[PDB]
Scaffold this active site. Sequence first.
Site, mmCIF file in Angstrom:
data_model
loop_
_atom_site.group_PDB
_atom_site.id
_atom_site.type_symbol
_atom_site.label_atom_id
_atom_site.label_comp_id
_atom_site.label_asym_id
_atom_site.label_seq_id
_atom_site.Cartn_x
_atom_site.Cartn_y
_atom_site.Cartn_z
ATOM 1 N N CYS A 408 -9.137 23.311 0.907
ATOM 2 C CA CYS A 408 -8.874 23.867 -0.051
ATOM 3 C C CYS A 408 -9.828 23.554 -1.220
ATOM 4 C CB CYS A 408 -7.463 23.612 -0.750
ATOM 5 S SG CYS A 408 -6.860 21.996 -0.607
ATOM 6 N N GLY A 413 -3.804 19.397 -1.863
ATOM 7 C CA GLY A 413 -2.688 20.526 -2.402
ATOM 8 C C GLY A 413 -2.477 21.467 -1.179
ATOM 9 N N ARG A 414 -3.021 22.688 -1.113
ATOM 10 C CA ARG A 414 -2.928 23.492 0.017
ATOM 11 C C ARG A 414 -2.996 22.977 1.444
ATOM 12 N NH1 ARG A 414 -5.227 27.311 -4.207
ATOM 13 N NH2 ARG A 414 -5.697 29.303 -2.969
#
EC number: 3.1.3.48
Length: 486
Positions: A408, A413-414
């Site tokens: 990401c 995060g993602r």
Amino acid sequence: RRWFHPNITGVEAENLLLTRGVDGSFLARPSKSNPGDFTLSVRRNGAVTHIKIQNTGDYYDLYGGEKFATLAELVQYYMEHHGQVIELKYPLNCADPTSERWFHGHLSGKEAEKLLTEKGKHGSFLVRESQSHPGDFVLSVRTSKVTHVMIRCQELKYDVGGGERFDSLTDLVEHYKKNPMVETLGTVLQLKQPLNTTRINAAEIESRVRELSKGFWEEFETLQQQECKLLYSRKEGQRQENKNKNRYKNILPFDHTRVVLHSDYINANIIMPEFKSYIATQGCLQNTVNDFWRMVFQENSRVIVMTTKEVGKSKCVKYWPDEYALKEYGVMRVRNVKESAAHDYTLRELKLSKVGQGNTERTVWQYHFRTWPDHGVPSDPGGVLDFLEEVHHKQESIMDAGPVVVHCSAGIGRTGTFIVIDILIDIIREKGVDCDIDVPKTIQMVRSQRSGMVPTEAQYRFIYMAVQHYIETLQRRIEEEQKSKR
């Protein structure tokens, strides 16, 4: 994580720092002005300063400072590094046990016993508020029997009826974890692990989601209180020769799980489901494109998952050539054979090979997810699930396939959200609808391999929503195979 205070105001933080703290004393608290963000209340020159910690979804950004993976890594940095000069010298411990794993409060005698019988094992314990005596507490331990130990609160100090007196319940639990209580019949009241309430059978998923929807913030905060236990070394990333290989100078890979290039560095970690593998990496930099293709080749990666869109900031650099074009990335050669466009993603057929070696050639399928929003997470998880099913079926089709490269921006995060969903849905795909799944325990397991995977509650809820959605499509499928159709 004693320095984190979950139920205090900005005014309460100032009083606690001025009356019970000194110059250099500090604490962390969730921002009530902006939900999701955090505040670092530090005492300096007999005055309290409040510094904002922005939880963007990709990282923990200190307002007018550095970017970090976890709140614990932020605190750990400033307690041993430079600089702000503001100093983080003494962590002000929290008396509130609400955010702890073992604490329940609402629980009763027979209710705690019924949970310990099925969900618990030898050493399972919990701390609940006393029913017959308001103000006091009860410690219920499983060992094969369940033993109840009263915790009397005498003048804000806690005790088991004899011995040392503690300022908080966390201090009582931590002490008796090291020095276990001995029963009259020679039995040892071992405090091995707290009772697992988050562990659920994949059939009762909808009921658990319903409970947390009325909840989710309470469960995620408990998981965030465990990030002090994941403070592994990140020395290789801290190197002078490795600083510009990092997108964010402080979001560094763990030395014990990092990808070593056999000029041996890359901000990437090998994710192994410790109960298909993954390479959780940051978004490609213009100076790390060559190192990325060395990693894909060495680890024998056949599927690349790009969670960031093509279309006002750089998250990932174009590490692949144009359709039908061929490019040389040092000793590695990449050929973009064909680009297939779907509504949610773009599949790029890339042929990776070492220069001078035609035999080393393999097909690398790069999945480029585009539909993900700029800010926040989507409410519907269908698009991500259809994408991950396609990623899994491509991975399963290849005989000698290595880990799935997921990226990401910071690669936390993602990347964390996509990896955790894929791990949990893989259990449901292989072991069917009836299987034990634990969302925070899977995240914590992923977190021990890469710094602060799944940093937000919104991303935490999205995993629960994706798992619930995947089980529902499976349940409808079996029901359709039994449905009379024309």
